[PDB]
Amino acid sequence: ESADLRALAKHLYDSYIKSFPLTKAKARAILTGKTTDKSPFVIYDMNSLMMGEDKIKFKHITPLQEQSKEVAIRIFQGCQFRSVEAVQEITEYAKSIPGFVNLDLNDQVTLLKYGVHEIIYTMLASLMNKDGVLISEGQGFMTREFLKSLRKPFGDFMEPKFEFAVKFNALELDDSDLAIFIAVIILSGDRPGLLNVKPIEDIQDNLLQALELQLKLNHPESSQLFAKLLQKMTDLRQIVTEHVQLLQVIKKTETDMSLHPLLQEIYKDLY
Amino acid sequence: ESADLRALAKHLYDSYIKSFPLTKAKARAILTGKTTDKSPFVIYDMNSLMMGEDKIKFKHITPLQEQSKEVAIRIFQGCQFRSVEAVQEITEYAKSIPGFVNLDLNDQVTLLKYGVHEIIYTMLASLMNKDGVLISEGQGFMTREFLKSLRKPFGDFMEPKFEFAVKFNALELDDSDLAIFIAVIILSGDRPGLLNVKPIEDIQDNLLQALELQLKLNHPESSQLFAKLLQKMTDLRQIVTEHVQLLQVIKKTETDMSLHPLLQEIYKDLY
Ligand SMILES: CCCc1c(OCCCOc2ccc3c(ccn3CC(=O)O)c2)ccc2c(C(F)(F)F)noc12
Ligand SMILES: CCCc1c(OCCCOc2ccc3c(ccn3CC(=O)O)c2)ccc2c(C(F)(F)F)noc12
């Protein structure tokens, strides 16, 4: 039913605004300059990075760890911290998705374990453009060129996400759209080790309907926007697999690395 | 006018029926012996428990967790699992209380965050009699005696809710009464961190009027039920402070640390 599907859309959007501090609308305002409260410090090379990290004078020290390593590894650690925080926000949002908490508790973990990074790259695009990405709660902007030039492996962890973002952002989705798309990703019946597949697919079918209606009602001039959005779901999967492999590379080229206890669990036995 | 207050009550009752599948009328019929045809499985001890635990799995894999830990901890974890489910139902009901979704987003989160526990205990009384509580949407019935027999910490974690349900159920409230009372509790202007108190009080004032007329009409012979009902909140606030306080001890003296990413994160400045 339309009325129902519209209510679900409205619901997902609300918990989305509640679960994710930096939305696309806000990210865009900062990137476009439209907003007015604090222009982002730009990090595009080694000297601006030092000044950006030590910029800590009027801006206190983020909850993330300090440092005592090289640049590449220090960015890797910042990506981990930030990624761990995202996971906490996505889990909170996942709980508001009608049906999700009613699922077998093991499948709730499985859908989270496999859909988390897919969601992190999808939403990370909201903070990107072809020249860089907003960091530190929209406080800074690290250029694509800088991140791409990091010694060997580290650089390849970044560029892929950018090529994805540039194509994903051409779809022009907004928060209300993304709120439903994210939910479609989490309720994926094809995740490895799911015990009760059908109940999860029935919910996804419902969200898929809500998403289609949402796309037709918010972008009436965008032909097949629904299909082209679902296609990007394959791009996401490639990002994660690629990422998982570069993680294997890093185990051979770096010394004591070790990921955060929460990220280690997600990657334990991951495709 | 009465008519508007009565129309609000009916709106609240209808939303309530949609948000909460197992109503008091339904539960009381099961707790008694109406339409004798599906007497729930009664768990009255450890053997019966495990006998019915794998009985709601003997069919298929969809419990809350299975045998592989201390029974007391496993029952405590099932309570958490169900608690997170109830939160989602309460949230959905909240959205139907006139005025709620128009409040500041942050305040909504805050009202729910502190109100849910008071609501969960209030509503659990509908599923209890002096001797036990209906579980798994009325599929099971676990005896208060058994809940009480759980080792020291866990046992006295359950009994206070039974002590509260007996005294509460003596007020003889029905679903149409409870729908309004629930709404009154959610719209409490004294929760910590509320940004706009005035509007929350204005809404609650209209609900207090609705609840009072409802009680005056539905229970004419129950002298001052309205006042006695408001007074029960002091007992609920107390029950919550106890439960929260007892949660401290549990967090400070236990092994199993695998919980639901809701209640935990939810607790903040929570008395
Ligand atoms: C979600 C990370 C987004 C991100 C950036 O996005 C670029 C693409 C990031 O791709 C990732 C995402 C997650 C990552 C890594 C490396 C490890 N992880 C953690 C994980 O795999 O869960 C790389 C770039 C820089 C930062 C920083 C900074 F280092 F500046 F503090 N924090 O977060 C960044
Ligand atoms: C809402 C709990 C209701 C309840 C029961 O009610 C007894 C009183 C429950 O009191 C509570 C209420 C909330 C609770 C706990 C323990 C943790 N929580 C979550 C929380 O409030 O933080 C205990 C008893 C057993 C179960 C089970 C079973 F273990 F059988 F699967 N599921 O749910 C039960």
UniProtKB/Swiss-Prot annotation, chains A, B:
Residues 1-46 are annotated as: Interaction with FAM120B. The keyword S-adenosyl-L-methionine does not apply. A motif (9aaTAD) lies at residues 261-269. It is found in: Nucleus; Cytoplasm. Residues 4-269 form the NR LBD domain. Induction: (Microbial infection) Expression increases when incubated with M.tuberculosis or its lipoprotein LpqH; induction is TLR2-dependent (at protein level). Coiled coil: none annotated. PDPK1 activates its transcriptional activity independently of its kinase activity. GO terms for biological process: BMP signaling pathway; cell differentiation; cell fate commitment; cell maturation; cellular response to hypoxia; cellular response to insulin stimulus; cellular response to low-density lipoprotein particle stimulus; epithelial cell differentiation. GO terms for molecular function: alpha-actinin binding; arachidonate binding; chromatin binding; DNA binding; DNA binding domain binding; DNA-binding transcription activator activity, RNA polymerase II-specific; DNA-binding transcription factor activity; DNA-binding transcription factor activity, RNA polymerase II-specific. Keywords: Activator, Biological rhythms, Cytoplasm, Diabetes mellitus, Disease variant, DNA-binding, Glycoprotein, Isopeptide bond, Metal-binding, Nucleus, Obesity, Phosphoprotein, Receptor, Transcription, Transcription regulation, Ubl conjugation, Zinc, Zinc-finger. Phosphorylated in basal conditions and dephosphorylated when treated with the ligand. May be dephosphorylated by PPP5C. Interacts with FOXO1 (acetylated form). Heterodimer with other nuclear receptors, such as RXRA. The heterodimer with the retinoic acid receptor RXRA is called adipocyte-specific transcription factor ARF6. Interacts with NCOA6 coactivator, leading to a strong increase in transcription of target genes. Interacts with coactivator PPARBP, leading to a mild increase in transcription of target genes. Interacts with NOCA7 in a ligand-inducible manner. Interacts with NCOA1 and NCOA2 LXXLL motifs. Interacts with ASXL1, ASXL2, DNTTIP2, FAM120B, MAP2K1/MEK1, NR0B2, PDPK1, PRDM16, PRMT2 and TGFB1I1. Nuclear receptor that binds peroxisome proliferators such as hypolipidemic drugs and fatty acids. Once activated by a ligand, the nuclear receptor binds to DNA specific PPAR response elements (PPRE) and modulates the transcription of its target genes, such as acyl-CoA oxidase. It therefore controls the peroxisomal beta-oxidation pathway of fatty acids. Key regulator of adipocyte differentiation and glucose homeostasis. ARF6 acts as a key regulator of the tissue-specific adipocyte P2 (aP2) enhancer. (Microbial infection) Upon treatment with M.tuberculosis or its lipoprotein LpqH, phosphorylation of MAPK p38 and IL-6 production are modulated, probably via this protein. Belongs to the nuclear hormone receptor family. NR1 subfamily. The 9aaTAD motif is a transactivation domain present in a large number of yeast and animal transcription factors. This is Peroxisome proliferator-activated receptor gamma. The lineage of its organism: Eukaryota, Metazoa, Chordata, Craniata, Vertebrata. The gene is PPARG. The chain holds residues 235 to 505 of 505 of the full protein.
